Each structure stands twice: as structure tokens, then as C-alpha cells.
Design a protein around this nucleic acid. Sequence first.
DNA 1: TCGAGAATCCCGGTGCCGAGGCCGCTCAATTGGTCGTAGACAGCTCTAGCACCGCTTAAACGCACGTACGCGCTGTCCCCCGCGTTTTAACCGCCAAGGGGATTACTCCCTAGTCTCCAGGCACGTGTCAGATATATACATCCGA
DNA 2: TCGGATGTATATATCTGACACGTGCCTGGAGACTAGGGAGTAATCCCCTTGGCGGTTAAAACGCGGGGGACAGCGCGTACGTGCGTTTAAGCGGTGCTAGAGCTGTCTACGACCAATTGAGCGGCCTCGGCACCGGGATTCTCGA
Lengths: 339, 107, 105, 95, 94, 300, 176, 78, 80, 179, 97, 97
Amino acid sequence: QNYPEEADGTLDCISMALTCTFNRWGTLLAVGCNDGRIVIWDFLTRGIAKIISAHIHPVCSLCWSRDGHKLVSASTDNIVSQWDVLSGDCDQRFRFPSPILKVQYHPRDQNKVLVCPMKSAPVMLTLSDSKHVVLPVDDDSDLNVVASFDRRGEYIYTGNAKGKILVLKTDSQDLVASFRVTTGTSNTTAIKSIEFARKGSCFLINTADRIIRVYDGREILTCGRDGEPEPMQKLQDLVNRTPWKKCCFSGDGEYIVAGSARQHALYIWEKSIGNLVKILHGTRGELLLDVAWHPVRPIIASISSGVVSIWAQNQVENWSAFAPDFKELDENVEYEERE
Amino acid sequence: RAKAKTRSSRAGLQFPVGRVHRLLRKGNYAERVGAGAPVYLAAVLEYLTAEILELAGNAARDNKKTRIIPRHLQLAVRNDEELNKLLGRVTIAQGGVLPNIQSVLLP
Amino acid sequence: KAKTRSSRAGLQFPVGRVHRLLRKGNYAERVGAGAPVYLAAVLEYLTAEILELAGNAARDNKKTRIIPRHLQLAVRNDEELNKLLGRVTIAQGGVLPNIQSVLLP
Amino acid sequence: KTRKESYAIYVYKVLKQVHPDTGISSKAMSIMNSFVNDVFERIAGEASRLAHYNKRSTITSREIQTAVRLLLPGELAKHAVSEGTKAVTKYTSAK
Amino acid sequence: RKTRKESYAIYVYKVLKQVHPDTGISSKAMSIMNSFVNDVFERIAGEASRLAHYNKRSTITSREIQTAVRLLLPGELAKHAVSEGTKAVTKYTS
Amino acid sequence: PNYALKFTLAGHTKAVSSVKFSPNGEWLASSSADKLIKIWGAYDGKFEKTISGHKLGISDVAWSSDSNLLVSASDDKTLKIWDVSSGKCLKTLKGHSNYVFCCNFNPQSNLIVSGSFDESVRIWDVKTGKCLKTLPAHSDPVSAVHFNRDGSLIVSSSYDGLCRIWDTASGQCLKTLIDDDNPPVSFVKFSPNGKYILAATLDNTLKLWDYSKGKCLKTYTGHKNEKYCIFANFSVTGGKWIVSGSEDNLVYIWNLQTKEIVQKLQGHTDVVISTACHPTENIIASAALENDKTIKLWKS
Amino acid sequence: VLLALHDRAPQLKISDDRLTVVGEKGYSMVRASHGVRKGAWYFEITVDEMPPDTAARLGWSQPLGNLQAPLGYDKFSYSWRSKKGTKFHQSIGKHYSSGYGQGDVLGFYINLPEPHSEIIFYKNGVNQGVAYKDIFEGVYFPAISLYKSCTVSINFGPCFKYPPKDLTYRPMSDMG
Amino acid sequence: DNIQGITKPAIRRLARRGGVKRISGLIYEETRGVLKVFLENVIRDAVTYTEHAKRKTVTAMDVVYALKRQGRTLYGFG
Amino acid sequence: LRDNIQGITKPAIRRLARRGGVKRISGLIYEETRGVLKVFLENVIRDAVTYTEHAKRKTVTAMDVVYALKRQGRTLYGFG
Amino acid sequence: ARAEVHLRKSAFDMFNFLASKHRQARRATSMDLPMPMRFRHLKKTSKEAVGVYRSPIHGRGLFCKRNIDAGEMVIEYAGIVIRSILTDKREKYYDSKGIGCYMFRIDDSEVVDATMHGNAARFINHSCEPNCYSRVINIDGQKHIVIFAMRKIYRGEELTYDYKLPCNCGAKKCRKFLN
Amino acid sequence: PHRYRPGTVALREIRRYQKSTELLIRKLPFQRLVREIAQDFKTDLRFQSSAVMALQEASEAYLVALFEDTNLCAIHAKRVTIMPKDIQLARRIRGER
Amino acid sequence: PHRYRPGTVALREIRRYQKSTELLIRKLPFQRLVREIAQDFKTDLRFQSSAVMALQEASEAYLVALFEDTNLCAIHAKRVTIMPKDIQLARRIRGER
DNA sequence: TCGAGAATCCCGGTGCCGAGGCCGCTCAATTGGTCGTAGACAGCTCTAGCACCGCTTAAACGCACGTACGCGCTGTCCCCCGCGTTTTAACCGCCAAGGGGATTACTCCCTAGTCTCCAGGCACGTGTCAGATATATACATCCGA
DNA sequence: TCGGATGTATATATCTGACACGTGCCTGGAGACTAGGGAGTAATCCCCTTGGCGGTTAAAACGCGGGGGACAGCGCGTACGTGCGTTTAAGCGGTGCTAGAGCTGTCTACGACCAATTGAGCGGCCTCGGCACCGGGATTCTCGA
């Protein structure tokens, strides 16, 4: 099959769901609720697995690990704790400066996580102790800087508060590539969040003036430090003018999905050709919060005030599994069998 | 100075776009006609024309014919529900009616 | 020198606001000069017709103040105004005192 | 604290012409406002479609006259045409 | 020596030869389809003009055309036509 | 090739129900139809305890992933859930209107397939113990059920001879295996790739099925497969032997490349109906019916 | 010798040269209305266009058989399969002989003194097999049941192409 | 006068198209009345458009515009 | 919510019919009238919410109700 | 309990469809329109109009799930259009296998098979008190076997026709011989 | 000597006229009617032919729609034959009077 | 101990209600009905009061017109009491269905 | 329940004129660049909309009793349908004549546009009197007698 | 034909808050003068619209007969009025909070306009093949027995 088309139920059991993320395999989905409750379901038989009522405080960020065992907490008292899918116990606890927005593990080692505050440069720590490596950003003026790893674990792409991208190394801070995009005609605007694929090196640019640009993780390294690349594909909307909230990718780098922030909508483009091909809808007056794509099957999970809807292709039953020798034809099929 | 590709196949359509934009300028519908509104409108007109010509051509084949005469358009409009709700007060010339004998008349 | 066009035609509905509404509404390219005078005359005649037919029932119901029941009666008791206002619901309107033939004993 | 535009004073003047000893409430005034706007927009729309049907680009008193004879029923149409023609002549005589 | 006339014969002819590769169309059905196209164009443009006059604006964008189509067409046919138009605008965009 | 008896584990007071090893490969506990489930060893016959607390008979018994938590297919329309390390009768599965013959687990070990004699294959849980769905497959009672390797497909073996394969997500038929004769299918299972199923039907003719196409490939001759639910196994520890039960005081063990009569074990005194191999060792379990009541572990 | 007008399979491609049968998709068997009663009637079948993937079952059949009977259905109809020469007679499938070449001159014959039989596969005088033996007496019109629409002609002359050598026959200038 | 041109079989054939089983003997007079009313209410607006165009010939587009104002919208002309 | 289609009571249809001039009423008119009223309110409220969401507000002013009624063909004087 | 080597362990049935339940002019197909216009909408109706469940007459019957009006089409009886002497070979073959004969003929030259290839139209029993019949139409020469109705039929009734052995219908004037 | 039971010829006339499309009023009396009632609004007019065709189409479609709604009213009144009070009821409900 | 012959109270109710002008539906259930069926097109709306008044006026006028045309149909059918098939006939003649 | 007959449906044959395509030849679409302002964005405000609370009470409700109406059957009588015979103007082919429709050229005066100056219509603030609310009372309508 | 009882219309007393009226003012309408372009009006031409004449036949008109529906009546039994105690939420006031509609300052990104070049679209002229028309025989539905 391909991209989903039909509604296919929900899970309206847990009250006040807020965020969601997957593992590598596509069978683990934890939900940081509005009160610290962390709930996992099943996907094959769809039963509630484990409620982790960790904090008295709400949760704003989570992430899974490579072994399929470890998680990471982000409450409203800056608590980052190491969890387990066997026990589910608290390990680490300390206080940052007050804002914490999103965390991200290192891909090829579960030692290091990359933590991002609001009004500071993003900080990388370890999980052995409270060691933190100071990351330098080029502007250091507003300090509203986002940062993320690439796919394989080569570099760290960072995004400032002014519209310039730095490419650093994970330990020695090797500035090896940089680029400024010609944002419209006068103002260069900030970047919300940059996410990365699973097959290849393609990624997306999500600005603050509602334009999605498509790039590769090799062309910028070819252009070196202070080069001017072009967008591989420009994605935008004109009719409803369409603010965005959440961005992610399809299964093996085929399509691109991006949930909206106004009309409770889901749009599916094509990275290959470059045109919109399907519009989804739902409840007319809700508020879309978090969108997660399923890595080995076309399933999209969307949180809008607790409700998690699962667009799941609407399979169609038929014959020929009961009696595999009878073929249910459509019209007159005449022939002779054996010459 | 180079070649100029039209606005009819830059979007992959069939109905013209410059003629629609001229008819929105020469009509005094408003002052300032926007950017892509004639493209949107020409796509809508394409969709409706394709929708009605599908049923028209299908009935034209099913009456063992090759051309189309307006009886087929009468049948194709008045059979469906949605087009009957749209085209309420319209008399197609040479149209004819749909067969409907009541329950109590025939023996 | 401040001869308003309402005085220069001898009318009651103003002409400058009607010409402003015919320039603003984007009905055509150019607007002539006699057209808003003509249109204000027509609107004056229609309003005078409706108030003249309202005054009769206003005096008949022993009142000195026009009410929507009076307007409903004055519109619906005519023939040609009942064709011009083909379907219009008037708030607090009420209906005609109508009882059919065979209902009475 | 913004200005809204209406037709209260003019209906008040015509009422004081035809019935010199009465007053009117608010609801009847709002009904008469809506009636005047309705008849105005209907006549203007019909005149505009005539002017586009005849391949020209000007709205004149001739098209307003043809719009009135197409729109109103008989006796009311004749009286309104006489009123309009008298107004046009008494306007253009003392220009 | 004649004055040119606007029409829609070639465009109906093209869409017919896309969707049915054999079936021809006579004169009277062509006149009927011409009148039908003009009729739906008049309704949609008039409703969009009345909207843009209501909201204290001066510009017929695509958004008013969308709201006019949603107000005028009944249900499922509107749900298809809005998606067809949005696909056309997105292909025209880049 | 040189399997030799080490220990004879007799002591069952009634007909020995089934021999099933531990899934992690360290136990061989044996139960019987006497409403009593004992905990025996696999290498010396090390005894632990006997389960008591049933009401009617026992057809099938099962395990856990850590070989402690237990459940049995009880014949009072129940499936009482048990344990080795605590022994408490954990739960009891209602929802049956007829006897229960077989039950198994997904490899994730939180679901219970239930092909019972009420002929509608239900889908039960371990954590909640809740009937998820229902597969109304056959008009005949279920002989065996089995998941595939990952836990995504269920085979249906029944009396009519229709080896259908069923969906797990929404529960629908995908294919129906058919035959000219109408034999009762006794006990089948999948392959380590999920693309082969050895057929054990009551016609004195085994079959091996090409799953992806739907044809038979390699068979056997000269065997007694007529009466009961005769079990079949695998063997990769020695050669590619096919361990199967036998009605003539033997254990049907032959290779499938060879398709010959090369080795015949013997010693039982009743119809051998349940066999199983240790997953790594050269241990083949064997336990016949009521007139034998012994366990013969022939060790290479 | 001309063919029939009514005693024929109607939906076959009837060729205008009146000596060539052209078939259809399926086994709809034409029986040309000029066949034996007693003694001897020999004719040859010249083959013009024999494309591959054809089952040209040739032999003898009666007017008791169905028009939609494939030649090789019962004890009256005979069978000669292209692939592996197999006979199908009284619904009995036994792989009998080999195949046959393309572009020869075919032709079958029965020898019955008024019975002692020569029901033997005949092809350019080369034997492919002794077919059957000791029929009953009746009417045996020649039967043609084909799988494709193959252009195959027919011969009636006394100067044959490859006749059975030293043949007892009768010329087709007497009853046809 | 010449309202008798709409004869007795023509109203009968129109009612056979309408799907009517049996007809009494007053429908002819009622039908000629209703037909005369409708043709007056169309030809009035057609003649108004023609007199506004300063011509002496009724065209087809004027009849189509009058039918559009009535709310019936004939296709197949213009 | 489920009720308030039945919250329209049953002297009320009787009083509307006796404003309209009805003498004797059967016992099916109640549910038939509920169905008709529900259909009409749907076909007004849909265009009202369309004009609202096009205007980019979050309330439903009276002018939108007047415009929807005006396009349906049932003009209302007294609120514009 | 493990003491019953009990019989009824043979089915002789390839169709084990029978489950526990066994629940028993606005359109185009009831118009006066020409025939292929109804023949198109035939398939869009017949996939969901009717159902097949267990009947007391002979196994599985045909209980429709829609209130069919009189005069309209219901469903088509289609399959392998066999030619007339393969019928006898299949009679011998299904005599050898033990499955009954499912052969309706369009004409007396070509018959239509149902056992090897077909649809859900096989579950129509013979009865001497029918409420349906059969007419063959000409959809561009490719004729069909389509079943009309006779009277007003409600939800939960078996549909039968005359096929032209004692029958299990129990008619008021039954023939009891299906030849 | 055979006469049908009355009604069958009516039913086959209904089917035969609902089959085909034609014009059911002779064009010379209709043309004289159009000139006759156009005489009183402006003297010495001059019609085209297609305008007469358009008037004939519009009048015929209006009459057929009126007869369908009238027959619905008469079948509601538990009768068969159309009476003119049914025509007056239909024209008063529709809003034209 | 006096009871009227049935019909007279109906006639004086007809005269008494056709005399005056008021609102005949209680405003709290009608307001809850409007919010209830407006909930499904956009969540969390917020009505003014005059819009509710306008909807009440339009619905009441439409119902009164429908009942007048229905009573005309029923008097045509030589009966007195309104049946719902009369309502369906009126709505089908007018063109709304 | 049967047979003779009458319209429809299909097949074969002719033939011809209007779809279909080619060819040439023009007007407006397009790009490329300029210039001006309509609308988006943010920030402050203050007021109608939604909620809590409690008291009184019109009316909504449920349950008695009759009775007038809806309906179903029966008769009869009358009038619309089906067919056959006689008649007349609808339809077509045909020609002649000329009046108005259609197009071009050429002045030209009628409205757009810009500014400067003023008065009139609108929001806001106060008295007062037509009507809303009571009491009391002729008489008139209805069902009983 | 006549009588008692409630409901309504008629006549007066008392309050009260919408309606009518007086004021400040700012912004929109009038006065003067110009540009040029849409329209007004003469001027010519050609074909489509009116008018008629003669022949043919398809349709129209007029009688004659009868059985099938419209309507009047009558019997009955029943579903919906009219009236009496209660209970309940509808309605009126009083108090309280705030989301959201509305104004307001800036700017920049997007649409109208000008000149040329192209080239797709429309007008005109052959030409056949799908349908128009028509004789022939099988099929199917009617109605008296």
C-alpha cells in the first residue's frame, strides 16, 4: 500500500494526552500526559501496557533509546531522569536554568543526550554524571538556538535566532559548513525545528514564515564553509496561509507529511516530484498538538485534546482465503484449461 | 525574450486562464482580481464538466450510439442526486421526462 | 452657493449619498448624472406608498404610533405590494384573520 | 465609537409629510431601513445586468426606467415612471 | 468577414476526447454545455462578490472562491471540488 | 543416531496428557489427565511439585517465557493459570460453552489463542485475561492452533481438512487449503521461515506444503496415522529428522531429504501421542497413552 | 468435392474457397457431411497454415455425436494429441505416441471388407500407430475439432501427394 | 379569437407526456387560461428589453434574459 | 447531548397550528414537524457557520443569519 | 472426556461457510429505462443487497438484507460458460467426488458452470412456489442470466425459482418430480 | 370485432410519449398566438424564428411540470381524474398566486 | 356542570391567536437547540442574543406558511384533519424535495 | 386454464450531408520592469456573554370521560374512451422583393479628477405623557329546558 | 322560545420610561476648471423575413356504443376533545468574572500598467461513414372461451 486514507478509530481512554514519540521498531508509543502520566499501548493487539505516573508536574519532552529500554524525562522543574522498560525507576535529577524545550540522544551511543533551553545555547551532557560540554553558536545575541544530530551521527546541525546554520562536530566543535538562505527579500527569519530521515541524508527546513525547504546532507558538505546552496524542493501554501506546528517524514524517505496548527489538518506531499497529493481532515474545531509517523507501516498518530486518531488504510475483506481454489470473478471468464 | 510557456499547462489544466482573468476584469465584480483565483475557478469548472461528460458518454454507449444527443444529458443530470439538487429549475431543450408510473394506476 | 441637490430637485431623500453608494459598490465603470436623482425619486414614492397605507390601520386600531402589526397588515392587505414583497418574514408580524369555509358548523 | 449609516431621518420626514400628528417606534424604523436597502439593491442589480446585456458600459436614467418597468407590477410602475420623469425634467430645467 | 465570438467549443471538445476516446458530440449539446459553463461562472462570481463586499474588503482572493463553492454546492460534490482546486493551485505554485 | 534411554519417568496415575519442554530449554515437566500437573526435570527427572486444584480433565498445558508461569487447557470450560515458583492458581478463563483442547502464546507472551470445542477461535489475554476477538472458522472442533514465528499468522487445523491461515490485526481469512479427500487434521506447525507447514492428517499419508504457492512437495510412506491427534516435531540437533508420534509402540523419526525407513525407536507399551525435542540437546521426549504411563528419554 | 451447407459448425470462420476450414477459440467440431458408409473412401488433407499451440485431433466420428463434442470423447470418436501423442478414448488418457511435423500432407483411412479393420494412424504412408479395432456399422462423417483458427485445406484427387502405398480405395468423383 | 389554435388533442398529448391516466372536460379551458397568463408575463419583459435596445426585432437573447429573471434558465440558445 | 429535539413540547405545535388556522390534528404531526424543523435549521446553520469561518471570527452575528436567509430566498426585515 | 471416539467426523463438504449465526422508482433498477442502464447498477446493488445464511429446506438459503420492490433485478447468475459435452465429463467427475451439479444453461447449446467459478448466486433453492423468475438479455450480444422479482418482498425471505426426486418445498399443488 | 378494455391504450400512449422527444404543439397556430398577443404591447414587430422556438420550449416544459404536480395532488385525494381545483391548489401552494 | 360542544374553543383559540403578535416558542429550549446543532460544525462558538431572535423569527414564519398550505391541501382532499402525507405532498409540489 | 391475432424488435441494404481535418492568417499574451498602497502583525482596552444562586409559580403533566368522525361497503347512473368515416389545412418546394442589421468614420461634449471651503446630520444628555396596569360592570353566547 | 352563568368590551385612575427635542461639531458634499474618450450620428450594403401558389395526405372532427368510476348514503366504534389536582423548571432579580471584538501604528510584499513578439485559435473548403429510412419475420402480450 501507500499513504493512509480513512479514519479507523481512536483510543479515547487516557484523559489529557499531550505528546507522543516512537522507537526504532514501531511497537512502542509513550505519551507524556498533562500530569506526568507516561502511558504505553500495544499496536498489534492494542492494549494499554504501562502507566508511568512519574512527576506531579506535566511533561513536555521525551525520547526513546537505541536498545529499546531507556527513556528521558522533561518536567516543569527541569528534571531529566533515566528510565527503563523493565523497571521504570528514577535515576537522575537536577535543575537546569528554567526553560527546557527538547532533548535528543546521540544515535550511536546511549551515553550522550543533546539538551536545548530557550534563551541559551544548546547543551550536550552525558549519562554517567553531570558533565556538560559548552556548545558555541555564531550569533550569541538572542541565544534562541535549536540544534539536532544528523542521521548517522557525523555532525550536529544548529539553528540560530537570526537565520544562519552552523555545522559542528560532536566533540571538537569543528565548524565545517555554513549557509544563509535568501529568505524572501529583506528579513531572514528564525528556524522552528529541523528533523532528519532514516534512509539517506535528506532533511527539511521549517522557518517562521511558513515555507518548507528540502535539502540533502551531502550538498552542504560539498559547498563547504560559507557556501550558498539552493533548495532541492520548496513547499508552501497560499490559500489559507497555513501556519505549521509539527514536521516529520515518511517510511523510507518517499513522502513528506506535515501537520498544521489551525484547521486540524494533515498534508502529504512528494519529495520525488514535488506536489501535494492528499488532504486529510478530522474534527473541525480542535487543536493539533503532536504528529508521529509509523516507521514500518503507514500509520499516523495525531493528538488533539487527548484523542489519538490512527489513519489505517481501511482494509477490505473478501473470499479466496476460505476456499483457495475458487476464484471470485467479476464477469464472464470463458476458456479451456488443458490442451 | 525567450519562449513563453502558457498558464494553461503550467498548472496542468485544460480550461484557459487568461480568458477567465479577462472575464473577471471586464465584469466589475470587484476592483482587484487576485493572484490564483482564476486558476482555482478553472479547475472547478474542469471538474464539473468532466463529471457530467462521464455519465453522458456512458449512457451514449449504452443506447448503442456513437454521437451524443441531449436526451443523454437529460438522463445523466436527472438520474443522480447531487446534480438534481443543483440544477433545480432548468429546462433542457429537447429534454424529455423520466419514466414514472404511479402504483395504483396500473392493474 | 450651497444649493444641495435635494433642494435643486425638490426632494426628500439625499442624492450625494446615493451617488456615493453607486460609486463604491462597483456596479459599472462610469455613472451618469441623472441616475441618482431618478433613483431617489423612486425610493421616495415607494416609502410614501407604504406609510400612506399604514396610517389607515394606525387610526383604525385607536393608536397614535405605528407598530409592526400595522406594517404587516398594510403590506399584506394590498394586491401589488403583496407581489413585490413575495416572501419576506417580518419580525413580530402576525398573520391574517383567516378561517376557511367548511370549518364553521 | 464608530459611525453607522442609516435612513432614519428621511423616513421621519416623509412620515411628517403624510401624517402630521403621529410618531413611530424603533422597530418599525429598522424594518423600513431594511426595506429601502432591499429595493435599492434589487433595482441596481437588474440595471447592471441590462447594461451588460446591451454591450455598453454606462448606467443612465433610461436603463433605470427599463429596470423599473421590468420589476414592478402595473399601476405602481406607471406612477413611479411619472414621478421619475417629473423629477428629471424639474432637475434639468433649473440646472 | 464576421466579428469573432467567444465560445467554449474547443475546451469541451478536449475534455471529451480525454475522458471518452471515441464518442463525438453534436451541435445542440455543444450549445447546452456552453450555456451551462456560463451559468455556473455567473453564480460563483456573484456570490464571491457579495462576500467580499460584506466583509469590508476590496479583493477577490482564492479564499472567497473557496467559501462561495462551499456555500453553493451540495455536500459531496463540494468535498471533491475543493480538493481539485487546491491541487491545481499547489501545482501552479512552484 | 545413537539415542539411548537414560531415565524412565513413570508415576502418572492416569493417561499421560502431553510432554512439553521449557521454552528456554531446561525443564521437561509432564502432566496427565488426572487433574494433576507434575513438575519433572529434563536431564535426570528432577521433581519439584504437583499442581492440584482443577475440576475436570486436562488436554493441553503451557508455559511462560521464563518457564515459571503456567496455564492448562482444562476440560471444565476453563483455563486455570498457574505458576512454578509460587504455585498459586492465578486466574481462570471463562467464556467457553464447550471443552477446551489447545492453547498457546504469542512470542511476546501476553496473548492466549483458544481453539476450543465450541469451534469459534477466540483471542484471550494474559495481562487482563480478556477476550479480544473471535475467529468463527470451522463447523468442526479445533484440533490444534499455532502462531507463526513472529506472532502474526494463525493456522487453523480442523476435522474437515481446511488449513486456513488467519489474519491477526483484524482477524480475517487469507487462504484456504483444500484436498480431495476429507481427512481430520491432527497437529500441524509452521517452519523457521514461516513458509512451510508439515501436514499431519488422519489418512496414513503425511504432506509438506509450499505456503507461498499452495502445493505439496515431499511426503512419507509406511506409517500409522489414523486415530488421535498425532503430534509432529522438528530435529536439527542431529540430522534433519522429523520427530512424530506413532500408534504401533514406536516413535516416527525420519529425515526429509532421505524419505526412507532408516531408524525406528521402540520400547513403549501403548500409543505414543506426544513427542518433543529439547531445543539444543539431543533429548527427545516420548510419552504414550494410558496403558504405558512412562517417559522414555532416548539420549544420543 | 464441395462441403456441406447445414451439417456444419455454424460459428466457425467459413472460408470462401469451399475447401478450407478456419476455426475459433474452443473445441467446436465441424462434421463435413460426406463420409463413409461401407467399403472405401480415401482423401487427403493438405495443410496450408498450421501455427503452433494447436490440438488438431483428427479421426472418425458419427452423426450421433454432438457438434460441440471434441473429437476424442467416446467409443465412436478417436483422438490424436499433438503433445506426447496421447490417446483420449472413452475418457482414457494414456501417453501413446510422439508428436507430428508441420507442413506435411495428412490423411486417414479405414479398410473394411463387407469387420476386418485397418484403424491405424496414417501420415504420408508412415505409420504412427495401430489405433483401434472392430467398430460397429453406421455413418462416419469426417470430424474436425481445432484449437486455433488454422488455415488447413483438403484434397480429393486420384493423384495423391503421399498416399498409403498400394491402397484399396474409391475415387471421390462418385459420391461427392 | 385565435386562442383556439391550442386544440383539444394537443393538451391531451401534453398530459400523456405528463403521466396522466384520465382527464375530464374542464381542463382545456383552465389550461388555455394558464398558458395565456404565462405567455403574457414573458412577452412583456421581452418587449421591454427590445424597446430599451432601440430596435424593432425580438431576438433570442432577450427571451433568454426574461426567462432568467423568471427563474427558469433555458439552455441551448446563445 | 441527545434531547431538545423532544424539548419542543406538545402544546406548542398545537399553538402554532392554531395560529395557522388548523381545527383538528392527528397524532403523527408531532414527529413529522420535528423532522421538518430539524432539516430547515440544518440548512440555515450550515451557511451561517460558513460565513463565520470565512470572516475569521469566533461568533455568529445577526447579519450572517440575515445573509443565509437572503440567499435561501426568505428575506428578513428587522435586524439589518 | 477422552473416552469418546465418536462419529460425525466427516464433512464431505468443501463449503464450510455455515456459521453459528444464520441470521434470517427512486433508484435506477426499478425504472422503465432501457436494459443496460439497469445492468450497470446491477453489480453496485447485488454486492450488498442480499445475504446467504442457513435455511431449513437444504442447508444454506438466501435471506436478502433489503426490502426489494416488485419488478426489479436482483443479482446475476454467472460463471464458466461451458459447452455442451464437458457437462457429461463433469457429471462423471463430480459423481466421482461427491458434489452436486450446479449447471444452469443460457440456451440448449451452451451451459453455465457454477462449481468451479462463479459468485454468491449459487444459493438459490428450487421451489414450486417461487417469487422470482428468469429472463436473458442482450448486453451487446454477451447474454446473461439475471433474475428479476415478482411481488413485493420484505427483509428475511428466501428467494427461489422454477428449475423446470421429491422436493423440499411443500407446495399447495406440488409436482414432487423435478423432470 | 375486437375492442380493448379501456385503459390499456392510455398506458401504452403514456409509455410511447415518455420514450421519445419531439414538439407536441403545431407551430403555425402557436406562431399566430405569439404575434397576436405581442400586437398589444408594440405595433409592427418582426420576430425571428429561433425566438418562437425558445418560447415553445419554455411553455411546453412549464406545462409538463404543472401536470406532474397536479397528478400528485389528485392521487393524494384518493381519486384518478384531474379536476381544475387540483390545478388551483398546486398553483396556490407553489407561490405563483 | 357545563362542557362545550367540541370545536367552539378551537374556533375562539383561532381568533385569539390570529389577533395578536407574540412569540410562541419558549426561548431557553430554542436557544439550547441552536447551541446543540451548532456544536457539530465548529466547537466553542459564542452566540449573540439578536441572532437567536432572528432564527426564532425565521423558523416561526416558515412553519406558519407550511401549515397554511397543508390545510389547503387537506380541505381539497374533502377531510378536516391534517395527515403527514399532506405535508409531504406540499413540500414536494413547492420544490423543496 | 388455452389459441388467433396485433404491435415491437431486430437485420439487411442503400445513400448522403454534416462532423472532421487541413490551411492560412491575424490580435493579444507574455515577459520584463516599474510604483504605489492594502493588509498583516502586535498591543492595549472594556463590555457583552457565560456562570452561580435563590424564590415563586404558570403551566406541563397524567388521567378520567364520552362523541363525532373516518372508513368501509353498496348502488346507480352517467360520461369519457375506442374506432371508423369523411374533410381541410399543415408541410414542402418554390420564387421574388427590400428594410433593417451590421459596420466605419468623424467630431465633441460629459464625466473623472483634483482641490478648497462649509453646514448638517450624528452621538449625547433631559423632561413628559401614550400606554401598560389595575377595578368594576353591561351583555352576549352557549347549552340546557 | 326562554334562562342562568362566565368572558369579554367599555369606562376611569396612576405611573413610568421610550420618544421627542436641544447642542457641539467634524467630515463629506458642493463649486470651478480641465482631458479625452465613449458614444452620437451620417452612410452603405446584402440577406434574411415576409408574402404567395400549387399539390399531397396526415391529422382532425363527428357519431355510436357501454361499462367503470364518482358520489350519495348508512352503520359503527374509537381516537381525540374538555376539565381537575400537582409538581417543576421557566422566569426575574442580583452579583461576578473575562475572552474576545474593536481601534491603531508600520511596513513590505503583491498586483495594475506599457511595449513587442510570437503562435494558438478561428474562419473557410473537401469528404466520407454513421445514422436516416425502409422491407421482412420471429417474439410477446391480450382477451374471450
